[PDB]
Amino acid sequence: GSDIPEHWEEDASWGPHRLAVLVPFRERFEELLVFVPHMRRFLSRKKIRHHIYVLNQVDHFRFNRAALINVGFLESSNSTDYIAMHDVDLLPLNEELDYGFPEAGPFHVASPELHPLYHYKTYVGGILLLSKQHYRLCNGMSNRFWGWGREDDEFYRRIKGAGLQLFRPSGITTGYKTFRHLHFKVDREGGLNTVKYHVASRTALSVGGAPCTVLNIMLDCDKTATPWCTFS
Ligand SMILES: O=c1ccn([C@@H]2O[C@H](COP(=O)(O)OP(=O)(O)O)[C@@H](O)[C@H]2O)c(=O)[nH]1
């Protein structure tokens, strides 16, 4: 079923920021069906205003998460002022995870001490929140990886290079049960200001009543610069 409960309604007590949840996506139908209402629930109990954007890559190039996140940033509503780059299959179970506006610096929700798998100090993946100003300060993510290498560690380099520091949950006592987990040297130049794309369609989707926006994105690839985008 699809009724909308009361606690999904916003009021003046939720405060002033609004989160764009940017979900890069390919063939994760099953996980999405759990994810959209899970997050609507989780965030709405925490009084976090949000909109969820499923970034659906429908060109026939290799899957380029980073490039998709750049598009999500660019296509998200101007009423959102921070983003959460958020894997579709990592669900937060702990109400103390801070998905609030990360004013001091990028906030890595899925820290290695909390992730069910990954465990190294500069692991930057899974769930990462930045203010739109900070994401712009970093020039967003590299578009050049096309699924190869570690686009996340390159992002960590952009964060430090921009003068920012990274913060992580403190005082969290659940462990590898904090989340439910459902189951390359390129040029440094470019990112948010060089991503090329178009949106083939936008679709309003409700999942048991919980809304999200599906963006069907066609990324362009300059095959002379990154021929390997075709290598799929
Ligand atoms: O073929 C893919 C690859 C990944 N993703 C998205 O990118 C995230 C991270 O990719 P994946 O979980 O496959 O790798 P991991 O982050 O666990 O190393 C996923 O949670 C999805 O949101 C996707 O939807 N389809």
Ligand SMILES: [Mn+2]
């Ligand atoms: Mn995963």
